[PDB]
């Protein structure tokens, strides 16, 4: 199959550059333009520019002229995009995209998997995990997973045995530059005296593994 | 640049019923070679755009037969003959006649179901957190439809502003509902200076707003 | 600096 495989997630401080690689297989690399597209959160997708691998010729959108450099390594079937001067508004998932037309015929595009680039001065930190205790039918309880960086955290309930009624919310970015998330579960009111409820929180970057019991106050 | 205009922006669909998404281009995308440089893709959370229809009307490999595309050089239609839960997500048209490649505004397809009011729950800050110097108060709006909901926080019956953040789950595959969590964040000092903590929830499924509350110290 | 639809020509 036609495949485009990009490098991993990036966290960069404002002003730093990022260089994303896009290795290809399953077609003749020299024959297709390689395009770069991003999509920031709360924005439509945006075309960055393209490279023509045979010549190495590049074309960039007005807004990225002077801050983006696209290159390729024919021997490795890989294209690269380097974006300099990163600002918060460059936080986005970045894609490489094989073109449609080889000179003779025109077909579909093929997309890489995406590379998340997060622009932030925050350092790695593990969350504190606090209970959301059920109140004095159907009852709700949960865990607040607070003040961590970077994404992601994972949450399970009772070591994966409780899945029904679980809602684990998207994280929000606080003005401190740290993330917070909540995981809740709805359960029978009848179970609150007898059933143990434990949220299992993992945050790999900080080697955090927390098992927090959630019980009535 | 070529300008793409996409409609509608929001498309709730009853299970088994069809969906149509329109896209119009500011100039013809029918090249004189006969190729129509208009494509349709589906964006789901945390993964690449999935090509649905390319060069105006060609179905990509592995895309269900219920998807099809047609159009003139300027006006295009993505048709989905029935809409499953698997089809829920953000649909875009895009032109590649010229660079920059440009995109329509996007259509948010969701499953339509009967209106469901949220179950509301308020959670006070834990003692453990208060020891650290901060108080998070959390309001859960559980399993509602449609997605539009408003949370208004009140502290000693005074309307709060600028000190809360929320987030919403993706639509539930089984029951077609959304859930929302809102977190009010105050310093320990500010938390101890007030007594009544309330979240007031407005939703189409509720005849009047529902308030859940607690008093600091039970 | 042509676009790919114009390659064949």
- A122-217 has which CATH code? 2.60.40.10
Which residues pair with residue A110 across a beta bridge? A98
Name the residue facing A144 among B48, B138, B169 (closest C-beta): B138
CATH 2.60.40.10 assigned to B1-112: yes
Alpha carbon dihedral A99, A105, A108, A109, in 10-degree steps, equals -10
| Residue A186 CB-density burial (10 A; 0-12 exposed, 13-18 middle, 19+ buried) | buried
Other Cβ atoms less than 10 A from the Cβ of A76: the count is 12
Nearest to A113 by CA among A194, A30, A23, A34: A23
- The structural domains of chain B, with segments of one domain joined by +, span 1-112, 113-218
What value, to the nearest 5°, has the Cα angle with vertex B27 and ends B26 and B33?
Answer: 150
How far apart CA A171 and CA B189 sit, in angstroms, is 26
φ, ψ of residue A214 to 5 degrees: the values are -115, 115
Q: Give the separation between CA B70 and CA B22, rounded to whole angstroms.
A: 10
Question: C7 at the A interface (CB within 8 A)?
Answer: yes
| The pair of three-digit structure tokens given for residue B185, joined into one six-digit string | 């964040």
- Encode A91-127: b = buried (16+ Cβ within 10 Å), e = exposed: bbbbbbbbbbbbeeebbbbbbbebbbbbbbebeebbb
> Distances in Å between the alpha carbon of A47 and those of A179, B94, B95?
29, 11, 11
Distance CA B6, CA B26 (A): 11
* Cα–Cα distance, B117 to B149 (Å, whole number): 10
Residues 90-119 of B with CB under 8 A from C: 96-99
Burial class (CB in 10 A: 0-12, 13-18, 19+), B74: middle
Q: Is B191 helix (H, G, I), strand (E, B) or coil?
A: helix
Closest by Cα among B45, B30, B38, B32 to B6: B38
Final resolution, Å: 2.0
Token pair in block for residue B78: 């993505």
Q: Give the B window 148-167 contacts with A, CB below 8 Å.
A: 165-167
Domain boundaries, chain A: 2-121, 122-217
Contact: B51, A47; criterion CB under 8 Å = no
**DSSP three-state, residue B182:** strand
Residue ranges of E strands in chain A: 3-6, 10-12, 18-25, 34-39, 46-52, 57-60, 68-73, 78-83, 92-98, 110-111, 115-119, 128-132, 138-148, 154-157, 166-168, 172-173, 179-188, 198-203, 208-213
Sequence-ordered list of residues with C-beta below 8 angstroms from that of A103, at least 6 positions apart, any chain? A31, C7, C8
**B87, B109 contact by CB (below 8 A):** yes
CB contacts of B97 in chain C (<8 Å) are 3, 5
Q: Which of B32, B42, B62, B96 to mutate to test the interface with A (most CBs of A within 10 A)?
A: B96
User: How are the residues of chain B apportioned to helix, strand and coil, as percentages rounded to the nearest 5?
Assistant: 5, 50, 45
Task: Enumerate neighbours of A (3 or more CB pairs within 8 A).
Answer: B, C
Chain B residue with the nearest C-alpha to that of C5? B97
CA–CA distance, B87 with B67 (Å, rounded to integer): 10
In the three-class reduction of DSSP (H, G, I as helix; E, B as strand; rest coil), residue A153 is classed as coil
| Listed residue (A6, A5, A3, A35) closest to A20, CA to CA | A6
Cβ distance of B55 and A106 shorter than 8 Å = yes
Q: Judge whether B1-112 and B113-218 match in fold.
A: yes
Interchain contact, B103 vs A45, CB within 8 Å: yes
Task: Say which DSSP state B55 is in.
Answer: T
Tokens of B194: 């007030």
List the subunits that have 3+ CB pairs under 8 angstroms with C: A, B
SS3 category, A62? helix
Comparing C-alpha atoms, which of A103, A117, A100, A99 is closest to residue A39?
A117
User: Bridge-partner residues for A210, per DSSP?
Assistant: A201
Kindly state the tokens that stand for A108. Answer: 């579909």
Q: Looking at the complex, does the CB of residue A127 fall below 8 Å from at least one CB of chain B? A: no
Characterize the bridge pairing of strands B89-95 and B107-111: antiparallel
Q: Measured between CB atoms, which of B58, B96, B167 is closest to A169?
A: B167
Q: Are B102 and B5 in contact (CB under 8 A)?
A: no
For A78, A186, B124, B168, the CA distances from A164, given in Å and listed in that order, are 44, 8, 24, 18
Strands B10-13 and B107-111: parallel
User: Judging by DSSP bridges, how do beta strands B150-155 and B158-159 pair with one another?
Assistant: antiparallel
* The total number of residues written for chain C in this structure: 9
Residue C5 at interface with chain A, using a CB cutoff of 8 Å? yes
- Domain formed by B113-218, architecture: Sandwich (2.60)
């Amino acid at each position: 199959q036609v495949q485009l495989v990009q490098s991993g997630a990036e966290v960069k401080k404002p002003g730093a550059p990022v260089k994303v690689s896009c290795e290809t297989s399953g077609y003749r690399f020299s024959d297709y333009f390689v395009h770069w597209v991003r999509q920031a959160p709360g924005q439509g997708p945006e075309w960055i520019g393209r490279i023509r691998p045979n010549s190495g010729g590049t074309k960039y959108a007005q807004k990225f002229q002077g801050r983006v450099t696209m290159t390729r390594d024919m021997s490795m079937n890989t294209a690269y995009m380097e974006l300099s001067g990163l600002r918060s508004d460059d936080t986005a998932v970045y894609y490489c995209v094989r073109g449609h037309c080889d000179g003779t015929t025109c077909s579909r595009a093929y997309w890489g998997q995406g590379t998340l680039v997060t622009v932030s001065s925050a350092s790695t930190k593990g969350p504190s995990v606090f209970p959301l205790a059920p109140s004095s039918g159907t009852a709700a309880l949960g865990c607040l997973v607070k003040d961590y960086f970077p994404e992601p955290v994972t949450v399970s309930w009772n070591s994966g045995a409780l899945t029904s009624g679980v809602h684990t919310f998207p994280a929000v970015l606080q003005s401190s530059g740290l993330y917070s998330l909540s995981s809740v579960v709805t359960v029978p009111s009848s179970s609150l005296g007898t059933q143990t409820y434990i949220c299992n929180v993992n945050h790999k970057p900080s080697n955090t593994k927390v098992d927090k019991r959630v019980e009535p106050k | 640049d070529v300008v793409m205009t996409q409609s509608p922006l929001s498309l709730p669909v009853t299970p088994g019923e069809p969906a149509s998404i329109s896209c119009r281009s500011s100039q013809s995308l029918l090249h004189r070679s006969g190729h129509k440089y208009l494509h349709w893709y589906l964006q789901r959370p945390g993964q690449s755009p999935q090509v649905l229809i390319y060069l105006g009307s060609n179905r990509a490999s592995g895309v269900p037969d219920r998807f099809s595309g047609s159009g003139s050089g300027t006006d295009f239609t993505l048709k989905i003959s029935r809409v499953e839960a698997e089809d829920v997500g953000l649909y875009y048209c895009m032109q590649t006649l010229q660079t920059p490649w440009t995109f329509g505004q996007g259509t948010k397809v969701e499953i339509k179901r009967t209106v469901a009011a949220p179950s509301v729950f308020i959670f006070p800050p834990s003692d453990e957190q208060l020891k650290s110097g901060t108080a998070s108060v959390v309001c859960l709006l559980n399993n509602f439809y449609p997605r539009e909901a408003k949370v208004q926080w009140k502290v000693d019956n005074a309307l709060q502003s600028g000190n809360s953040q929320e987030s919403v789950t993706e639509q539930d595959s089984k029951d077609s509902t959304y859930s929302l969590s809102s977190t009010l964040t105050l310093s320990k000092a500010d938390y101890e200076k007030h007594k009544v903590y309330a979240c007031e929830v407005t939703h189409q499924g509720l005849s009047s707003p529902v308030t859940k509350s607690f008093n600091r110290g039970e | 600096m042509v676009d790919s639809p114009q390659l064949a020509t």
